[PDB]
């Protein structure tokens, strides 16, 4: 572990809202004077049992209530930048979900201020380079996304890419092709969750329609050889999330996980923690689960760590 923790890494698939620890959640609630459904930290922590993506999501959004002030968004981001320091993540390209917050009345500018501040502290004090990614909520309309992109236009230099998360199945990338088109046009790079719960088809759609620069998750590509051959050939990065997939039941066990398999095949896979407060591990704890349940070698360790550097935007 300490050896794994010492490796230099990049984290390219990480949702800031999913770094919200039960302890922080209770504290922000107290500061904001909010009566929580949950009786204590322990009761909330026990609630992190999932049978799929949605059950997690419903919870994950409920937690966003305590996020209300610039200082809230600072605290959340800075706490994660500190974990990055502990685990020697020297670089971050994190997600946030503007709509989760703006739809609750919080001004877009407040959300951004607190995160940006934290990120500045991250680089000047911690030596952590960052590339903020703005994610669209895919269960919601393209209209709503467009409205969000309009909010982001004045801020466009704060974001290296637009992303796409939330309930994957039944909301294909094609749903958002116009806004993504428009985003690239306004000079955004792009990325997307594809093939977490949804079919490989969604991953071709991400590559070709949404013109992503990397596939987030992407594990279900394993069912599609033609796709595999493309991944391997184009060296398109995949931001894979071990704990997330186990917690969400994408795999029934860590021993069933295919990330090493892909790696030995030449796929440019990376190790990321995704929603660390909900999956019980930051990036180092992900590498470690690989070692424990799949006898990952120090060899493959260094290799996955290096891909995360290579795949930076
Ligand atoms: Cl991994 C993932 N998939 C869909 N929605 C999400 N929100 C935070 N992480 C997410
Ligand atoms: Zn994710």
């997307």: which residue's tokens? 192
What is the DSSP-derived secondary structure letter of residue 92? E
For residue 275, say whether it is annotated as part of any ligand binding site.
yes
Helical residues (DSSP H) of 218-297, grouped into ranges: 225-234, 242-247, 259-265, 276-279, 283-294
Q: How far is CA 225 from CA 110, 168, 200, 229, 265, in A?
A: 45, 22, 10, 6, 11
Ligand 1 atom at minimum distance from 168 CA: 4
**Does the Cβ of 274 fall within 6 Å of ligand 1?**
yes
């030995």: which residue's tokens? 264
β strands within the chain, DSSP E: 9-11, 89-92, 95-96, 129-130, 133-137, 161-165, 189-190, 192-194, 215-217, 238-240, 269-271
What is the residue range of 285's domain? Answer: 1-313
């996304």: which residue's tokens? 145
Q: What is the distance of C-alpha 3 from the center of its chain?
A: 24
Degrees, nearest 5: CA angle 243-312-183 = 100
Please list, in sequence order, all residues whose beta carbon lies within 8 angstroms of the beta carbon of residue 136, skipping any fewer than 6 positions away: 99, 145, 148, 162, 163, 164, 165, 176, 179
Degrees, nearest 5: CA angle 198-202-203 = 110
Q: What is the distance of C-alpha 252 from the center of its chain?
A: 21
Query: What does DSSP say about strands 95-96 and 133-137: parallel, antiparallel, or unpaired?
Result: parallel
Which residue has the least CA distance to atom 8 on ligand 1? 15
For residue 13, say whether it is annotated as part of any ligand binding site.
yes
Spell out a b/e string for 46-75, using b for 16 or more CB atoms within 10 Å of the CB, else e. ebbebeebbebbeebbebbbbbbbbebbbb
Number of domains into which the chain is organized? 1
**Does the Cβ of 138 fall within 6 Å of ligand 1?**
no
**Does the Cβ of 19 fall within 6 Å of ligand 1?**
no
Degrees, nearest 5: CA angle 165-22-18 = 15
Q: What is the CA radius of gyration of the chain?
A: 18
Which three-class secondary structure state does DSSP give residue 67?
coil
């959340």: which residue's tokens? 76
Whole-angstrom distance, CA of residue 101 vs CA of residue 67: 8
CA-based end-to-end distance of the chain:
28
DSSP result, 27-59: HHHHHHT---SSSSHHHHHHT---SSHHHHHHH
Whole-angstrom distance, CA of residue 257 vs CA of residue 221: 13
What is the DSSP-derived secondary structure letter of residue 273? -
Which three-class secondary structure state does DSSP give residue 198?
coil
Ligand nearest the Cα of residue 52 is 1
Whole-angstrom distance, CA of residue 113 vs CA of residue 128: 18
What is the DSSP-derived secondary structure letter of residue 78? H
Which three-class secondary structure state does DSSP give residue 163?
strand
Whole-angstrom distance, CA of residue 16 vs CA of residue 95: 6
Whole-angstrom distance, CA of residue 106 vs CA of residue 99: 9
Q: What is the CATH number of the domain that holds 300?
A: 3.20.20.140
Ligand 1 atom at minimum distance from 13 CA: 1
């Amino acid at each position: 572990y300490e050896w794994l923790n010492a490796l230099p890494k990049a984290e390219l698939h990480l949702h800031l809202e999913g770094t919200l620890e039960p302890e922080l959640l209770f504290a922000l609630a107290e500061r904001n004077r909010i009566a929580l459904p949950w009786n204590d930290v322990e009761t909330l922590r026990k609630a992190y049992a999932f049978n799929n993506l949605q059950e997690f999501l419903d919870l994950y959004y409920a937690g966003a209530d305590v996020l209300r002030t610039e200082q809230d968004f600072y605290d959340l981001t800075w706490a994660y930048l500190q974990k990055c320091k502990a685990q020697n993540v020297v670089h971050v390209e994190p997600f946030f979900d503007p709509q989760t917050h703006t739809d609750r009345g919080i001004p877009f500018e407040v959300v951004l201020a607190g995160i940006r501040a934290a990120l500045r502290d991250g680089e000047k004090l911690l030596g952590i380079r960052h590339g903020l990614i703005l994610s669209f909520l895919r269960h919601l309309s393209e209209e709503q996304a467009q409205k969000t992109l309009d909010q982001a236009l004045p801020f466009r230099d704060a974001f290296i890419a637009v992303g796409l998360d939330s309930s994957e199945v039944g909301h294909p990338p094609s749903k958002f092709q116009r806004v993504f088109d428009r985003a690239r046009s306004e000079g955004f790079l792009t990325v997307a969750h594809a093939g977490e719960e949804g079919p490989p088809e969604y991953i071709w759609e991400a590559l070709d329609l949404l013109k992503v620069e990397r596939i987030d998750h992407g594990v279900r590509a394993f069912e599609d050889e033609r796709l595999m051959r493309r991944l391997i050939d184009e060296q398109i990065p995949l931001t894979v999330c071990p704990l997330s997939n186990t917690k969400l039941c994408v795999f029934d066990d860590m021993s069933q996980h295919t990330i090493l398999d892909m790696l030995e095949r030449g796929v440019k896979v990376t190790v990321n923690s995704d929603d660390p407060a909900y999956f019980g591990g930051y990036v180092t704890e992900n590498f470690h689960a690989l070692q424990q349940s799949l006898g990952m070698t120090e060899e493959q360790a260094r290799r996955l760590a290096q891909n995360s550097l290579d795949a930076r935007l």
